[PDB]
Design a protein around this ligand. Structure first.
Ligand SMILES: *[C@@H]1O[C@H](CO)[C@@H](O[C@@H]2O[C@H](CO)[C@@H](O)[C@H](O)[C@H]2NC(C)=O)[C@H](O[C@@H]2O[C@@H](C)[C@@H](O)[C@@H](O)[C@@H]2O)[C@H]1NC(C)=O
Ligand SMILES: *[C@@H]1O[C@H](CO)[C@@H](O[C@@H]2O[C@H](CO)[C@@H](O)[C@H](O)[C@H]2NC(C)=O)[C@H](O[C@@H]2O[C@@H](C)[C@@H](O)[C@@H](O)[C@@H]2O)[C@H]1NC(C)=O
Ligand SMILES: *[C@@H]1O[C@H](CO)[C@@H](O[C@@H]2O[C@H](CO)[C@@H](O)[C@H](O)[C@H]2NC(C)=O)[C@H](O[C@@H]2O[C@@H](C)[C@@H](O)[C@@H](O)[C@@H]2O)[C@H]1NC(C)=O
Ligand SMILES: *[C@@H]1O[C@H](CO)[C@@H](O[C@@H]2O[C@H](CO)[C@@H](O)[C@H](O)[C@H]2NC(C)=O)[C@H](O[C@@H]2O[C@@H](C)[C@@H](O)[C@@H](O)[C@@H]2O)[C@H]1NC(C)=O
Ligand SMILES: CC(=O)N[C@H]1[C@H]([C@H](O)[C@H](O)CO)O[C@](O)(C(=O)O)C[C@@H]1O
Ligand SMILES: CC(=O)N[C@H]1[C@H]([C@H](O)[C@H](O)CO)O[C@](O)(C(=O)O)C[C@@H]1O
Ligand SMILES: CC(=O)N[C@H]1[C@H]([C@H](O)[C@H](O)CO)O[C@](O)(C(=O)O)C[C@@H]1O
Ligand SMILES: CC(=O)N[C@H]1[C@H]([C@H](O)[C@H](O)CO)O[C@](O)(C(=O)O)C[C@@H]1O
Ligand SMILES: [Ca+2]
Ligand SMILES: [Ca+2]
Ligand SMILES: [Ca+2]
Ligand SMILES: [Ca+2]
Lengths: 219, 219, 219, 219
């Protein structure tokens, strides 16, 4: 009765999409998550969802560490929880996207982790590990591999300015991004440059997507 | 020997009203609570009690998060503990009231929860879920459903001012309240408007009740 | 292998005085304590020791909450740990004293607790419960029963001034004390009034004792 | 499946050098460490590594308490973790060194601990216990036995100045050091006095070593 993630939940015989308790190896108090039990056989732990612009994603370091929003709607699970999940086994990442024309695409990454070898993942800036792309959305994440997480109030990017401030989001920014899924909910085509919910490989630098979901499952 | 609430305590063969250790799913350190083993067959976990005005209830955010008073007297268990209890199963709420003429009434709610789907219940303001009224006191809580918790130093209400400051309490204020059980212990009829221990549906807007107890049990 | 106190350690077959790991009900991480396995059959958990004046006891709230000194020498275990121990069962208190003439005396209290019913024992000031005196030192603690703990930087006493500042210690001060075992190590008779390691019932108001040990065991 | 250290990992049949989860007695959440499964039969828990100067070691108290760097490279595990490991059993210390001429030497200490009897190891300054030298590097640590840990922002040394500031490191400084393995990565011979990665007994006061590893195993 102590599943470590949504795959453990599924394999214990819980087949319905919804909110479940999980207990990562180094987070034994555990916490609630949204489980996707449908995509590619199910067992995905959601850590990010955009769908309606109801939640402010232009938040500081503490909010991105601790999480915000609601599991049933738009949310960010929190980097401390994403670290606890991704360090306990080898995980893949699934990213579901939707445009405002009801077009959908996905990106799959064979390996995904946050601060995997960091003694203090918070001080080390929750650095991204990501490799092995496949899917229909194209790759907009591999160039982010190795980058620390940057917020408007904590700059660990490779730009002379703050990428999070400039592109109004929070991400593993380099100089600055190919993806920006925590960017502003600008609702489709926008004149502003690359500061919406962007996945450059699918819809370019000036299209804020309607829906994103980022979720993990052990390989 | 790890009951999750006062019902687990009762069903393990502890029939006496009093203080017991409970261990919620996501609060495994556990904590002590007052158990009501009498009301409607027993197994109720108390989280609020007014009885004599001996404890200051006009407290800030941190006090309402962490709890205050004593389990054997006037107390608030703390929103972090009420979140830990109400997210681990489906709970009902029982509210016992007494006026200064030894009149008593109660309100029962078939569903009750605090920050049930909140990634960070503290940042999300411990929002109230409450439905399905029955009893003798009348309903003074259903209009509060969906509201965040507001204190004198943290305003998440739907008023242009701070409802907690204005009505000298701490509650899931809208604009502003039908109930105010954490209000001032003004002892019966008062000239001041709605700033005492108010349950509007029973005793109106200018009567501070002698006794309140708010308690939960799994359905 | 999870003893809750020094009595559990003793009954598991550890007969030697020394440092052991204990795991109180609501402090499951556990911590190390000094166990007295000799006094009245053994199984006493030490929480205070004076013996040489090597450790500064004139410390603030945080130090008295979290503890200081070393388990093998002069120390204060910390009110958070003393709360965790005394709330998990019914404990007695033993107080061993020594003067500078190698005279010894003790006080035994049939009941002892710190913040026993406090929702937040820290905010409630770790109030003392103590009753049922017997021994050779006389009673210098029963008048302290019901008092919150006062430090130089947090005044919860019944004096118009700060008793901890005035008598250079930290205690469940009333107005102000009959005992002051966390007072200055003034080494025997002193001109200053009641600001040393005082046990008034044995050695009066102007004698700083050489040795004190305060320790607990379940009845 | 809850090894307390790298020796428990080894004896469970994990023979490969690498990163593993360990669960110390009083740190039950556990954490990841680098295990050396080769040196003198294996089972060593690494807590310090220098190899390339890629990580800043001139850090403050909080960084030395909580840890920094990466387990696969240069890192400091953190004094809170080193306290949790060394208080749960009797440990020996192994120190591996390398100069820039591919010369190697080691120091072995039959006993090693950090804040072993400290009620609050952080407030007590994580004092060093170390005894019983043998090896090829010579002894540069025994004179540090009994000293608290000093950083540039927290001075507990026996110098009139701050040893950590003066020798640009963080250590159990006396007045001031025979070893300085958290000093600046100055890369071999340097004109500056004793402010590099120094092991005085092997390479003197003006030679910053290429590689250091500090690791522990139960005797
Ligand atoms: C894009 O998908 C949407 C979600 O399924 C469609 O809206 C939904 O249409 C349902 C019937 O298919 C209807 O019951 C739902 O109420 C509605 N959902 C929402 C969120 O509005 C949408 O369909 C268009 O809009 C609706 C309201 C109807 O007028 C349809 O005829 C429209 O095509 C899809 N959009 C397009 C452009 O196809
Ligand atoms: C309202 O209920 C109160 C609590 O039961 C009553 O007071 C209690 O009366 C007991 C005998 O019934 C007595 O032993 C208790 O000491 C007392 N409790 C307290 C808290 O005072 C109260 O009764 C009135 O007051 C008491 C002191 C007597 O004088 C009675 O004759 C009074 O009726 C009840 N009040 C009324 C108005 O009935
Ligand atoms: C009070 O008790 C002390 C602790 O036992 C005595 O000192 C100890 O005496 C031991 C022999 O009995 C000796 O081996 C210890 O080294 C010594 N301990 C310390 C802490 O000094 C003390 O005895 C007096 O002082 C010692 C040094 C001798 O000179 C004795 O002859 C003295 O009586 C006791 N004091 C008195 C006044 O009896
Ligand atoms: C000191 O040890 C180093 C690590 O083993 C040597 O460098 C390594 O040499 C390997 C072949 O032995 C080679 O495959 C590795 O790429 C290389 N590692 C690194 C980190 O460079 C080093 O050997 C000297 O430098 C290398 C590049 C060659 O030119 C050798 O001929 C050199 O001797 C050793 N240094 C000395 C002075 O022996
Ligand atoms: C959103 C984003 O990161 N855009 C960045 C672009 C693109 O990387 C480039 O056009 C390749 O598409 O490069 C810069 O102009 C640049 O190199 O100075 C910085 C700018 O921040
Ligand atoms: C205690 C309380 O909340 N009273 C509020 C009342 C009642 O809601 C209303 O009289 C229905 O009974 O409405 C207001 O006057 C209003 O709408 O502007 C605000 C006031 O704060
Ligand atoms: C150490 C101590 O508390 N002394 C206190 C004494 C004794 O309580 C009293 O002499 C009975 O022995 O009373 C006071 O003088 C007083 O009542 O004003 C205050 C003073 O702080
Ligand atoms: C690195 C270091 O600690 N050097 C110290 C040296 C050596 O201890 C001494 O030369 C023995 O080798 O002593 C001092 O000069 C001294 O005593 O005043 C202080 C100086 O900080
Ligand atoms: Ca930057
Ligand atoms: Ca407001
Ligand atoms: Ca006072
Ligand atoms: Ca100094």
């Amino acid at each position: 009765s102590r599943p470590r993630d949504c795959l453990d939940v599924l394999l214990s015989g819980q087949q319905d999409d919804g909110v479940y308790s999980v207990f990562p190896t180094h987070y034994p108090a555990g916490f609630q998550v949204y489980c996707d039990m449908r995509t590619d056989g199910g067992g995905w732990t959601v850590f990010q969802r955009r769908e309606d612009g109801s939640v402010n994603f232009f938040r500081g370091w503490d909010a991105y560490r601790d999480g915000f929003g609601r599991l049933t709607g738009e949310h960010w699970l929190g980097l401390k929880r994403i670290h606890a999940l991704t360090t306990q086994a080898a995980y893949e990442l699934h990213v579901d996207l939707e445009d405002f024309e009801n077009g959908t695409a996905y990106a799959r990454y064979g390996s995904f982790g946050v601060g995997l070898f960091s003694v203090d993942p918070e001080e080390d800036g929750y650095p991204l590990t990501v490799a092995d792309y496949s899917g229909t959305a194209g790759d907009s994440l591999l160039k982010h591999s190795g980058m620390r997480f940057t917020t408007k109030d904590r700059d660990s990017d490779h730009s002379e300015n703050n990428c999070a401030a400039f592109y109004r989001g929070a991400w593993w920014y380099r100089n600055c991004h190919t993806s920006n899924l925590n960017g502003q909910y600008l609702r489709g085509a926008h004149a502003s440059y690359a500061d919406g919910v962007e996945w450059s490989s699918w819809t370019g630098w000036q299209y804020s997507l309607k829906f994103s979901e980022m979720k993990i499952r052990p390989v």
